[PDB]
Design a protein around this ligand. Structure first.
Ligand code: SF4
Ligand code: NA
Ligand SMILES: [Sm+3]
Ligand SMILES: [Sm+3]
Length: 263
DNA sequence: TGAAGGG
């Protein structure tokens, strides 16, 4: 029988799909099975990615001269699945280190619990894993085309050529745009991320509820992703929460339909 | 197929 990727008609996954998988994998699976519970207009997928590419093309020189940017797109094939996400903030420190900052806002002025910090440390660790591959030439246009099925010489929609030529862009095909994105990622002296920072903010008080500086370890991050991707590719069954974390079920939308918590 | 969201 088919895989969860094919069952849910998915061609890629969001970075936070793997994060919530660290919360509960069964709950993530139910959200993709039962999906009803949880400035430029485009609608062809070739146009959507072209906007993402144009954003990258401006964000790279902005980062390298101004020293900081926001909402940087990231993508890359991880263990046979294209992962797609957005980094909150990238900036250079005073000592010249490239630091990724993740901003989490909480409703109540309350510390996060280790279950949530585990999920968020994994999320920012995934941003570093994908970003490092991008600027080191491990992310290629062929892998992007393989997973999304973009058509490279379908001409770009007038909405995006208009906005392209506005910021000086005599680009015509989508392949032109892709070739330029990977040149600029790999040859503009972009370093790998050195520091990972999660800040928890109660935004009505503007009070800092804690700062996590994530210790990155490539082998552990790859091991966990390999385990999590094994579900989506279809090689193992999804696991629910451990018995010590059964309190997660008290607030789960899918608590009545699930069969893990019972037995 | 905006991604993230927040426990
Ligand atoms: S009821 Fe518990 S084990 Fe089942 S999907 Fe929800 S959180 Fe996971
Ligand atoms: Na964001
Ligand atoms: Sm924005
Ligand atoms: Sm955020």
């Amino acid at each position: 029988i088919l895989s969860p990727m094919e069952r849910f008609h998915l061609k890629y996954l969001y970075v936070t799909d793997l994060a919530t998988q660290n919360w509960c994998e069964l709950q993530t699976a139910y959200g993709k099975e039962l999906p009803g519970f949880l400035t430029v207009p485009v609608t062809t997928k070739e146009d959507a990615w072209a906007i993402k590419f144009l954003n990258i093309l401006l964000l790279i020189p902005t980062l390298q001269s101004e020293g900081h940017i926001r909402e940087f797109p990231v993508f890359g094939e991880v263990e046979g699945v294209l992962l797609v996400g957005v980094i909150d903030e990238l900036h250079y420190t005073a000592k010249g280190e490239l630091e990724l900052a993740e901003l989490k806002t909480r409703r109540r002025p309350m510390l996060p619990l280790e279950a949530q910090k585990k999920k968020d440390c994994f999320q920012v660790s995934l941003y570093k894993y994908i970003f490092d591959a991008m600027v080191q030439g491990k992310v290629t246009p062929a892998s992007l085309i393989h997973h999304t099925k973009l058509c490279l010489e379908k001409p770009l929609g007038p909405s995006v050529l208009r906005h392209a030529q506005q910021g000086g862009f005599s680009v015509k095909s989508l392949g032109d745009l892709m070739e330029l994105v990977f040149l600029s990622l790999t040859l503009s002296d972009l370093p790998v991320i050195d520091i990972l920072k999660i800040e928890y903010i109660h935004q009505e008080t503007a009070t800092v509820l804690g700062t996590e500086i994530v210790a990155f370890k490539e082998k552990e991050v790859r091991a966990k992703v390999q385990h999590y991707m094994a579900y989506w590719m279809g090689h193992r069954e999804p696991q629910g929460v451990d018995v010590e974390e059964a309190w997660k079920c008290r607030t789960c939308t899918y608590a009545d339909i699930c069969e893990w918590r019972k037995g």
